[PDB]
Structures are given as structure tokens and as C-alpha cells.
Symmetry: C3
Subunit: 148 residues, 3 copies
């Protein structure tokens, strides 16, 4: 199997795939919040679910959308960076640590966001998860530059 | 050519690339709607195209933006998942089916969204396209976990 | 090192990684603008930083968010397209030109957006950066189709 191409790759693919599933969960939650609070973005949805007055914003829906958007701002770059990084032959334990800190930080971020935890808990989880991304980005820069 | 690295890869790259082009089309449509309805997000744009009163929101522009955002929530994870999945040696016909259901589901989603089709047509196309993504995600999880 | 898998790959990884770092910079700027203008998206953030009245929108914050979102609409597809394209054996100089035009166009786009430059400067930088993406997309389509 091509998951054996590099020692860090299986750990990367496990953590990345879990985070994609975590984003799908946020999408599902968002939909459930829309249905339960009757707050739809489109008139066609609202008219199916009670009438035109349910085409409206809602603070819990907006919060879900922000959590999902922040995921797209951070998890998507990790998908790219962590994949490339997996092929630069980093120490396997060190790679594991980058991926684990990102995974735990991002899961905690979503819990802190949707659970409305006090500041600066969410902000800290964001920063902690960004550290391994910044680290991987720099390492890729050096490897790319030196092969020019 | 490295498109021969796995039997499912050419089908994946065809479907993914078509969907990226489909997102570019949504961007172009969004711009056309802004120009035609004179609804710009920035004062600098509005002042070039008729005056400061054209810095305003518009429901058709907002609809285009939602379609584009939903694309980013679903097509981007597919780009990652479908690529990795292509290298796990799935049955070629089964892989084709995952990619085709995603492609047709997503194209139909954009048509349903921008064409303002009645509920739950859009919601159904979303769910149908998510099925192959969920399937690929699970398969990747198993392959990654077993190589740890 | 696997950065030697194709002659265009190091140039791609340099430009892509710089653009990911450029998006992180936009995130950091956005946070600084929120703190300095006291415009927070969440009540929990606002209550930590002066009171509930600082849970409010702000035009500079909204501008930062639009710049970041436009990045996600354009840089993320480039991450996918430029990676695949790097493996299709394009002329190395021609590949360099695609990646450089995208890099310069996107950096200029963010400068034009956040610096509030007059129209159509931002719009031109967007279009110029989309050209190499469109070109790569087409080339991938042809390579994928011909291997079906
Ligand atoms: C019957 C139905 N209704 C709806 N949806 C709605 O009424 C709806 C839901 C939401 C909230 N969003 C979500 O929760 C997402 C995460 C799914 C928003 N707007 C609407 C609007 F469309 F009314 N879907 C199905 C469905 C049917 C068959 C399948 C299948 F045949 F595939 F099994 C699948 C789905
Ligand atoms: C002359 C011009 N104007 C504008 N744009 C605007 O006036 C404009 C447009 C929109 C809508 N967005 C779109 O439709 C997107 C999808 C392109 C929004 N805001 C503005 C604002 F800038 F006014 N662009 C060019 C252009 C020129 C040369 C090239 C080149 F030299 F590359 F050929 C390219 C473009
Ligand atoms: C003490 C603190 N405060 C905050 N954040 C806030 O008070 C805050 C900031 C913003 C603006 N966003 C940003 O600027 C982003 C780009 C970071 C918005 N909302 C809040 C809200 F949480 F109040 N963070 C830390 C922090 C502590 C330790 C670490 C560590 F231990 F990791 F060193 C890291 C961070
Ligand atoms: C990956 C998905 C994780 C989902 C996190 C769920 C957090 C829900 O947490 C709950 O949220 C409620 C409303 O915000 C609060 O009233 C409750 O105090 C809190 O327990
Ligand atoms: C604001 C504080 C800066 C945090 C940056 C954390 C990124 C550290 O990243 C580190 O950078 C080193 C130098 O490039 C590399 O040699 C290491 O491999 C890398 O882990
Ligand atoms: C990939 C791009 C697909 C674009 C889908 C275009 C759907 C347009 O469809 C049209 O939309 C109009 C306004 O919404 C409606 O008034 C019309 O009834 C409908 O035909
Ligand atoms: C809410 C209903 C759940 C829909 C989940 C659809 C995903 C099915 O996905 C399937 O999962 C199996 C078990 O992991 C795998 O063996 C299959 O290869 C995979 O196609
Ligand atoms: C990659 C990050 C690039 C950041 C671009 C910074 C552009 C800031 O540019 C400044 O913006 C101010 C407010 O918009 C204006 O008042 C100033 O005229 C302008 O110099
Ligand atoms: C609106 C004007 C259209 C701009 C499209 C620019 C994309 C050009 O892209 C070019 O397409 C050719 C034909 O497929 C390929 O042979 C070239 O390799 C490719 O660079
Ligand atoms: N787009 C972000 C940029 C900065 C950022 O990502 N901040 C983290 C830590 S405060 C966050 O959780 N932001 C909340 C969000 O994106 O909604 C924002 O507007 O806050
Ligand atoms: N961000 C989505 C999460 C759920 C989702 O993706 N739902 C599908 C099926 S109803 C959809 O088309 N949503 C419309 C949208 O994203 O604007 C939302 O707010 O609706
Ligand atoms: N989502 C975009 C689609 C079109 C686009 O990307 N346009 C470029 C050139 S005008 C841009 O810079 N848009 C500003 C933005 O995305 O906020 C929009 O609403 O404008």
C-alpha cells in the first residue's frame, strides 16, 4: 500500500481524515440548528418549513458558520502542509507530535466555539494548533528553496 | 505519465478538475450579478460603477456567495479525500462511481441553488454528494489506522 | 528527497507555501484589527475586552474577512492544481511562469484589498492570477481525459 511511502504518512492521514469528518459533523450540527431554531438562509427552505418569516438569521446558526469557516481557514492549509511535510523525512515522533497537537487543538477549538466557552480558551486553542502548521510551513520552505 | 500511478487516478483528476472549473464559473457568475444588479461589497468598487449607494447587499449576490461557500465546504475535502483514495487500490468501477456521484451531485447542487429550485432538491443533492465523501473518508481511516 | 520527483515541484512548493503563510498573515492582521477597533464576532470575546457593546461588526474587519475568503476561493484550488500540474512534466520555465504570475498576482491582490487601492486594481490582480490557474486546469483535464 502507498500509505507506506513515508513513515509519517499514516499518522498524517489518520489525523487529517478525522478532521475532515469533524468538519462534516459541524455541517450536520449547523443543519440541525437551522431546523430546530427555524432559521433558514433561503426563502425556498423557509417556505417548506413553516413560512417566509423563517428566512432569518440566528445567533447560534451564525456561530456554527463561524466555526465551520475557521475550520476552512486552518484545516485546509494543514491538509496541504501536513501531506508535503510527511514526505520530507521528518523524525517520525516529531511528525506525530505536529499532527497530534493540530488534531487536539482543532477539536478543542470546535468544542470551545460551539460550547461558548469563556475567552480566551478558543483563542488559545487556535494559536496552539497554528504552531505546528507554522513549523511545517517553514520546513517546507527550506526544502523547496534548497532544491531550486 | 504519473497519471498512471493508479487506475482510479485519471477519473479522479477529471472529476476534481471539472469541479474546480465549476467553482470558477460560480465566481464569474457572482461578479456578473454584482455588476448587473450594482451591488458591490467595497466602496472603491461602487464609486467606479455609479456611486457610493451601490455599496450594498443584494439577495442574488448573497445566494451566489452561499453557493460558492458550500462548494468550499464540500469540494475542497473531496479534492483531498478523492486523491488519497485513488492510491488505496479501490476497485476501479467502484472508484468511478464514488467520483461520478460526487460530480453529478455537486453540479446539480449548484443548479438547484442558483436556479432557486424548490426544497428539498438542493438539500438532497448535497446529501447525495456527501455519501461518496463519507465512504472515502472511512476507507482512508481504516487504511491509515492499520499502517500505524 | 521527494521534492526531486519532478523539476517543477520545488518552485510549486515554494510559491504555495509562501501563499499559505500569506493567508496566515491575513488571519493575524484580522485579529489585530478586531482588537484595535474593538469589534468582536462573539459575546465571550467582547466581554473579555471591554463589554457587550464590542460584539459588533466593523468595516475594516469585514474587509479583512473578504480578503481572507477570496484567498480561500483562489489559493486553495491552486494548491490542488499546481501540485498535479507539477507532475505532468511541463516545461520547467513555463511552470515557473505559471507559479510566479499566481504568486505575484495574489500578493498584489491582498495589498490592493487591505490597502483600499482604487478600482479596478484589485479586480485586475484577481484576473491575472486566475489565468495560470485556468491554464493548469485545462492541461490537467487533457491529461486526465487521455488516460481514461
Ligand atoms: C426530505 C429531506 N429534506 C431534506 N432537507 C431539508 O428539508 C432542509 C434541511 C436543512 C438543514 N440542513 C441539513 O440538515 C443538512 C446538513 C442536511 C435546510 N433546509 C432544508 C430545506 F430543503 F427544506 N433533505 C431530505 C432528504 C431526503 C432524501 C434523502 C436521500 F434520498 F438521499 F436519502 C436525503 C435527504
Ligand atoms: C477594466 C476592468 N474592470 C474590472 N473589474 C471591475 O470593474 C469590477 C468587477 C467586479 C465584479 N467581479 C467580476 O466580474 C470578477 C469575476 C472579474 C467588481 N468590482 C469591480 C471594480 F473593480 F470596479 N476588471 C478589469 C480588467 C481589465 C484588464 C484585465 C486584463 F488586463 F487582465 F486583461 C482584466 C480585468
Ligand atoms: C491571553 C490570550 N488572549 C488571546 N486572545 C484574545 O484575547 C482574543 C483575540 C482576538 C483576536 N484574534 C487574534 O488576534 C488571533 C489571530 C490570535 C479575538 N478574541 C479574543 C478573545 F479571546 F478575548 N490569546 C491569548 C493567548 C495566551 C497564551 C497563548 C500561548 F500559551 F499559546 F502562548 C496563546 C494565546
Ligand atoms: C466536533 C463537534 C463538537 C461539538 C461541541 C458541542 C458543544 C456543546 O456544548 C454545549 O453547548 C450548549 C450551547 O452552546 C451550552 O448551553 C452547554 O453549556 C454546552 O454543554
Ligand atoms: C511568534 C513566535 C514564532 C513561532 C514560530 C514557530 C515555528 C517554529 O518552527 C521551527 O522553525 C525552525 C526554524 O525555521 C525549524 O528548524 C524547525 O524545524 C521548525 O519546527
Ligand atoms: C455551474 C453553473 C450552473 C448555473 C446554474 C444556472 C441556473 C439559472 O437558472 C435560472 O435562474 C433564474 C434566477 O435564479 C430563474 O429565474 C430561472 O427560472 C432559472 O432558469
Ligand atoms: C447516516 C447513514 C450513514 C452513511 C455512511 C455511508 C458510508 C459508507 O461507506 C462504506 O463504509 C464501509 C464500512 O466502513 C466500508 O467498508 C465501505 O468501503 C464504505 O464504502
Ligand atoms: C500580505 C499582507 C499585506 C498587507 C497589506 C497592507 C496594506 C496597508 O496599506 C495601508 O492601508 C491603510 C488602511 O487600509 C491605508 O490608510 C494606507 O493608505 C495604506 O498604506
Ligand atoms: C476568457 C479568455 C480565456 C482564457 C483562458 C486561458 C487558459 C489558456 O491555457 C492554455 O490552454 C491551451 C488549450 O487548452 C493549452 O494547450 C495550454 O497549455 C494552456 O496554457
Ligand atoms: N477569520 C478570523 C481570523 C483570526 C482567527 O482565526 N482567530 C481565531 C482565534 S481568536 C478564532 O477562533 N477566530 C474566530 C472565527 O474565525 O470566527 C477572525 O475573524 O477571527
Ligand atoms: N453551512 C451549511 C451546512 C449544512 C449544509 O451544507 N447544507 C446543505 C444542504 S441543506 C446546503 O445546501 N446548505 C446551503 C448553504 O450552505 O448555503 C448551511 O448553513 O446550510
Ligand atoms: N466571491 C467573489 C467572486 C468574484 C471575485 O473573486 N472577484 C474578485 C475580483 S473583483 C474579488 O477580488 N472579489 C472581492 C471579494 O471576493 O471580496 C465576489 O463576491 O466578488
Amino acid at each position: 500500500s502507498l500509505v507506506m511511502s513515508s513513515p509519517a504518512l499514516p499518522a498524517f492521514l489518520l489525523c487529517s481524515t478525522l478532521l475532515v469528518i469533524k468538519m462534516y459533523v459541524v455541517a450536520i450540527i449547523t443543519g440541525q440548528v437551522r431546523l430546530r431554531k427555524k432559521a433558514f438562509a433561503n426563502p425556498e427552505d423557509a417556505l417548506r418549513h413553516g413560512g417566509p418569516q423563517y428566512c432569518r438569521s440566528d445567533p447560534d446558526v451564525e456561530r456554527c458558520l463561524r466555526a465551520h469557516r475557521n475550520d476552512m481557514e486552518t484545516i485546509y492549509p494543514f491538509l496541504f502542509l501536513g501531506f508535503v511535510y510527511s514526505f520530507l523525512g521528518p523524525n517520525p515522533f516529531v511528525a506525530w507530535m505536529h499532527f497530534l497537537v493540530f488534531l487536539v487543538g482543532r477539536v478543542a477549538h470546535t468544542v470551545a466555539y460551539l460550547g461558548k466557552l469563556r475567552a480566551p480558551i478558543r483563542s488559545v486553542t487556535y494559536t496552539l494548533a497554528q504552531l505546528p502548521c507554522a513549523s511545517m510551513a517553514l520546513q517546507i520552505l527550506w526544502e523547496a528553496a534548497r532544491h531550486l
